[PDB]
Amino acid sequence: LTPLAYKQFIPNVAEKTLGASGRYEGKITRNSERFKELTPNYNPDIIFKDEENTGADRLMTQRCKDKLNALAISVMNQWPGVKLRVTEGWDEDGHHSEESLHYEGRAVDITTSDRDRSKYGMLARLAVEAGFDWVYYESKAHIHCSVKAEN
Amino acid sequence: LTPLAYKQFIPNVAEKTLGASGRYEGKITRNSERFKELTPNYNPDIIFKDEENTGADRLMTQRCKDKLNALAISVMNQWPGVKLRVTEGWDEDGHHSEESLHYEGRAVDITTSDRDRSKYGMLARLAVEAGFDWVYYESKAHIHCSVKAENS
Ligand SMILES: O=C(O)[C@@H]1O[C@@H](O)[C@H](OS(=O)(=O)O)[C@@H](O)[C@@H]1O[C@H]1O[C@H](COS(=O)(=O)O)[C@@H](O[C@@H]2O[C@@H](C(=O)O)[C@@H](O[C@H]3O[C@H](COS(=O)(=O)O)[C@@H](O[C@@H]4O[C@@H](C(=O)O)[C@@H](O[C@H]5O[C@H](COS(=O)(=O)O)[C@@H](O)[C@H](O)[C@H]5NS(=O)(=O)O)[C@H](O)[C@H]4OS(=O)(=O)O)[C@H](O)[C@H]3NS(=O)(=O)O)[C@H](O)[C@H]2OS(=O)(=O)O)[C@H](O)[C@H]1NS(=O)(=O)O
Ligand SMILES: O=C(O)[C@@H]1O[C@@H](O[C@H]2[C@H](O)[C@@H](NS(=O)(=O)O)[C@@H](O[C@H]3[C@H](O)[C@@H](OS(=O)(=O)O)[C@H](O[C@H]4[C@H](O)[C@@H](NS(=O)(=O)O)[C@@H](O[C@H]5[C@H](O)[C@@H](OS(=O)(=O)O)[C@H](O[C@H]6[C@H](O)[C@@H](NS(=O)(=O)O)[C@@H](O)O[C@@H]6COS(=O)(=O)O)O[C@H]5C(=O)O)O[C@@H]4COS(=O)(=O)O)O[C@H]3C(=O)O)O[C@@H]2COS(=O)(=O)O)[C@H](OS(=O)(=O)O)[C@@H](O)[C@@H]1O
Ligand SMILES: [Ca+2]
Ligand SMILES: [Ca+2]
Ligand SMILES: [Ca+2]
Ligand SMILES: [Ca+2]
Ligand SMILES: [Cl-]
Ligand SMILES: [Zn+2]
Ligand SMILES: [Zn+2]
C-alpha cells in the first residue's frame, strides 16, 4: 500500500462533493433533536483524546463508527502495539471551518497512539481502505477523515 | 473532622441494609434497557482512571453523581492542589463480589489524585459528609462508597 502525501486528499475532489462525503446538512448541537443520531464510540482499541473532558470526541454517526472501527483493526495489524487515536470527533466548541463535518458527527481527526508523525501518511491510506468517504492529510499533526450522511 | 479507620464502614451496618444503601436490584449490562439510567460523569474536578479505556468508570446513577460531585468540592478544599479520583464506577468486567453495587452504577472506589494513602481515612470521612449512603475503607488502596437506588 502507498501512503498519502502531505495535503493529499482522496478522492481528489472537495470534501462536500457527491463523489466524496457530500452535502453538509446542519450543525448538530447537544440539545438538538438530531443529537440522538450520534452514538458514543467506546471502542477500547481506540484512544480518544477528549481534552474537552466532555466525551464529545466519542460522538459520531453510525457510518463514521463503522469506518473508524474498521480502521482501528487495520492500524493494530499495521503496527503491532499501536492503536488508532482520535483527537476530534463531533465538535461543539466551534473550532473548525464554518460548515465543518465535525459539527455533524461525520468527521474525525486522527493520529497513531504513539504519535509517530512518520506513520500518518500510511495512517491516511489505511483510512481510505477502511472506507472513509474523504481522507485528507490536513496537517503534520493529524489526518482528517469524513463520511457521507446516513441514507 | 475525624478520619475513618482501616476497615471501618459508616453507617456501621451492612451495605445492602435499609439505613445504608439498601437492596441490590439487578446487574446492569451495556446492552440492557437499564443502561440508559446511567449517565457519564464528566466533572473536570474528578479524575477517572478508566484503565479499561471504555468510559465505564464514568457511568453511575444520578444520586451517585450528586454525592460524588459534592465530594469533589470538599476534597479540593481539604487539600489545596489535590483532586478526587475514581478507579471503579459501574463495572462490566465482573471484578467485585457477586451482587456488587458497582454492577448497578451505585458505587465508586476512590482515592486522592496524588495517591497519598495517609489521606484516605479523611477521604472516607469527607465521602460520608458528602452524603454517600455507605462508605467503607475497604482497602489500603481505596475507599468504597455507595448510594441508595433512585426509587428511595
Ligand atoms: O515552524 C516551522 O518550522 C515552520 O514555520 C513556518 O515556516 C511555516 O508556518 S508558519 O506560518 O511559519 O507558522 C511552516 O513551514 C512551519 O510551521 C509548521 O510546521 C511546524 C513544524 O512541524 S513539522 O516539522 O512540519 O512536523 C509546526 O510546529 C510544530 O507543530 C506545532 C503544532 O502545534 O502543530 C507545535 O507542536 C507542539 O504543540 C502541539 C499542540 O499541543 S499543545 O500545545 O495544545 O499542548 C503538541 O501536540 C500536543 O501535545 C502532545 C504531546 O505533548 O505529545 C499531546 O500530549 C500528549 O502527551 C502528554 C504527556 O506527554 S509527556 O510524556 O508528559 O511528555 C499527555 O499528558 C497528553 O494527554 C497526551 N495526549 S493524549 O493523552 O490525548 O494522547 C497532545 O495530544 C497534543 O495536542 S494537539 O496539539 O491538540 O494535537 C506538539 O507535540 C508540540 N510539539 S513540541 O515538540 O512539544 O513543541 C510545535 O511548534 C511544532 O512541533 S514539533 O514536533 O517540535 O515540530 C507548525 O505548527 C506548522 N504550522 S501549522 O501547522 O500550519 O500551524
Ligand atoms: O487474603 C486475601 O485473599 C487478599 O490478599 C491480599 O490482596 C492481594 C491482592 O489481591 C493482590 N493483587 S492481585 O491482583 O490479586 O495480584 C496484591 O495487592 C496489590 C495489587 O498489586 C493491587 O491490587 S489490585 O489492583 O489487584 O486490587 C494494588 O497495587 C497497587 C500498588 O501496590 C500501588 N503502589 S504504591 O507505590 O504503594 O502506590 C499503586 O500502583 C501505582 C504505582 O505507582 C505503579 O505500579 S507499580 O509498577 O509500582 O506496581 C503504577 O504507576 C503508574 C500508574 O499506574 C499510571 N496511572 S493509573 O492510575 O495506574 O492508570 C500512570 O500515572 O503512570 C504511573 C507510572 O508509570 S510509568 O510512567 O513509570 O510508566 O500504577 C500505580 C497505580 O496503579 O495506582 O496502586 C496499585 C493499585 O491501586 S490503584 O490506584 O487503585 O490502581 O495493591 C497491591 C497491594 O498493595 O497489595 O497483593 C495483595 C496482598 O498483599 S501482599 O502483596 O503484600 O501480599 C490482601 O491481603 S493482605 O494480607 O495483603 O492485607 C487482601 O486483598 C486480601 O487479604
Ligand atoms: Ca478533542
Ligand atoms: Ca472539539
Ligand atoms: Ca476502572
Ligand atoms: Ca471495571
Ligand atoms: Cl461506557
Ligand atoms: Zn478535521
Ligand atoms: Zn467498590
From Swiss-Prot, chain A:
- Which residues take part in binding Ca(2+) 1? E51, E52, D57, T87, E88
Gene name tied to this protein: Shh
Residues reported in the UniProt entry to bind Ca(2+) 2: E52, E88, D91, D93
Per UniProt, Zn(2+) binds at: H102, D109, H144
Name of the protein this chain belongs to = Sonic hedgehog protein N-product
The record lists the organism as Mus musculus (Mouse)
User: How does the UniProt record describe the way this protein sits in the membrane?
Assistant: Lipid-anchor
| Recorded consequence of changing E150Q | Does not affect signaling activity in any of Shh signaling assays and causes no apparent defects in cholesterol-mediated autoprocessing reactions
Q: Which domain of life is it from?
A: Eukaryota
The free-text domain remark for this protein reads:
Binds calcium and zinc ions; this stabilizes the protein fold and is essential for protein-protein interactions mediated by this domain. The Cardin-Weintraub (CW) motif is required for heparan sulfate binding of the solubilized ShhNp. The N-terminal palmitoylated peptide is cleaved at the heparan sulfate-binding Cardin-Weintraub (CW) motif site. The cleavage reduced the interactions with heparan sulfate. The cleavage is enhanced by SCUBE2.
Subunit structure, as described in the record: Multimer.
What exactly does this protein do? The dually lipidated sonic hedgehog protein N-product (ShhNp) is a morphogen which is essential for a variety of patterning events during development. Induces ventral cell fate in the neural tube and somites. Involved in the patterning of the anterior-posterior axis of the developing limb bud. Essential for axon guidance. Binds to the patched (PTCH1) receptor, which functions in association with smoothened (SMO), to activate the transcription of target genes. In the absence of SHH, PTCH1 represses the constitutive signaling activity of SMO.
Localisation per UniProt entry: Cell membrane
- PTM section of the record: N-palmitoylation by HHAT of ShhN is required for sonic hedgehog protein N-product multimerization and full activity. It is a prerequisite for the membrane-proximal positioning and the subsequent shedding of this N-terminal peptide.
UniProtKB/Swiss-Prot annotation, chain B:
Q: What does the comment on domains in this protein's record state?
A: Binds calcium and zinc ions; this stabilizes the protein fold and is essential for protein-protein interactions mediated by this domain.
Q: Which residues of the full protein are shown?
A: 40 to 191 of 437
Where, by residue number, does Ca(2+) 2 bind? E52, E88, D91, D93
Annotated consequence of substituting N77K: Shows no change in activities at different temperatures
Provide the protein name: Sonic hedgehog protein N-product
- Description of how the protein assembles with itself and partners: Multimer.
Q: What does this protein do?
A: The dually lipidated sonic hedgehog protein N-product (ShhNp) is a morphogen which is essential for a variety of patterning events during development. Induces ventral cell fate in the neural tube and somites. Involved in the patterning of the anterior-posterior axis of the developing limb bud. Essential for axon guidance. Binds to the patched (PTCH1) receptor, which functions in association with smoothened (SMO), to activate the transcription of target genes. In the absence of SHH, PTCH1 represses the constitutive signaling activity of SMO.
Residues binding Zn(2+), per UniProt? H102, D109, H144
* Originating organism: Mus musculus
Positions contributing to Ca(2+) 1 binding? E51, E52, D57, T87, E88
Localization per Swiss-Prot or TrEMBL: Cell membrane
Q: How is it modified after translation?
A: N-palmitoylation by HHAT of ShhN is required for sonic hedgehog protein N-product multimerization and full activity. It is a prerequisite for the membrane-proximal positioning and the subsequent shedding of this N-terminal peptide. The lipidated N- and C-terminal peptides of ShhNp can be cleaved (shedding). The N-terminal palmitoylated peptide is cleaved at the Cardin-Weintraub (CW) motif site. The cleavage reduced the interactions with heparan sulfate. The cleavage is enhanced by SCUBE2.
